Amino acid sequence: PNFSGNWKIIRSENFEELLKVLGVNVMLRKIAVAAASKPAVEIKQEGDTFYIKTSTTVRTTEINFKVGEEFEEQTVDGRPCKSLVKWESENKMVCEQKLLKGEGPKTSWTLELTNDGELIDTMTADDVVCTKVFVRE
């Protein structure tokens, strides 16, 4: 049940389409899905404490969180939110998000490890799901 490693993306599904239904303009959508925006994910897990750094060729962000403790981040389309991660099972965490200001779609994410050691990242906004899959370097 160790999420640690340097994760490289091998599958992405419904990502631009998710951005589309959220009203993200076509320019940014095309930016977000270019080869150059391919995310590399570095995780350090120490029990329930996580450091996750997501990096592309042009952007780098990090979240530090402990499961069960509220933290602040941003939704898929960059809106500040308060997040709370909970274990759904030994190999899967789920994060509920609540906008800090205003109203919006219901957004959440999940991270889970398969027994073949792939990392599955899902992002939901209301009734729309995007799935990405990573493997370790």
CATH number of 100's domain: 2.40.128.20
How far apart are alpha carbons 67 and 75 in whole angstroms?
Answer: 18
Alpha helices in the chain (DSSP H): 15-21, 26-32
For residue 34, what is the DSSP state? S
Method of elucidation: X-ray
Resolution expressed in Å: 1.9
Number of domains in the chain: 1
How far apart are alpha carbons 41 and 35 in whole angstroms?
Answer: 15
- Structure-block tokens of residue 52: 């996750």
- Residue 113: give the domain boundaries: 1-137
Q: Which residues pair with 136 in a beta bridge?
A: 7
Dihedral sign of CA atoms 122, 113, 41, 9 in order:
negative
- Structure-block tokens of residue 60: 């780098």
Q: What is the CA radius of gyration of the chain?
A: 14
Q: Which residues pair with 41 in a beta bridge?
A: 7, 54
Helix (H, G, I), strand (E, B), or coil: what is residue 16?
A: helix
Instruction: Kindly state the helix (H) or strand (E) to which residue 136 belongs, with its residue range.
Output: strand 128-136
Q: Which residue has the tokens 């190999």?
A: 91
CA-nearest of 70, 67, 79 to 106 is 79
CA-nearest of 102, 105, 98 to 128 is 105
Contacts for 5 with CB less than 8 Å, ≥ 6 apart? 42, 43, 136, 137
Q: Which residue has the tokens 């979240």?
A: 63
Count CB neighbours of 101 within 10 A. Answer: 8
How far apart are alpha carbons 103 and 115 in whole angstroms?
Answer: 38
Contacts for 100 with CB less than 8 Å, ≥ 6 apart? 72, 79, 80, 81, 82
Q: How many helices (H) and strands (E) does the chain have?
A: 2, 10
How far apart are alpha carbons 79 and 84 in whole angstroms?
Answer: 16
Q: Which residue has the tokens 């780098």?
A: 60
Residue type, 114: T
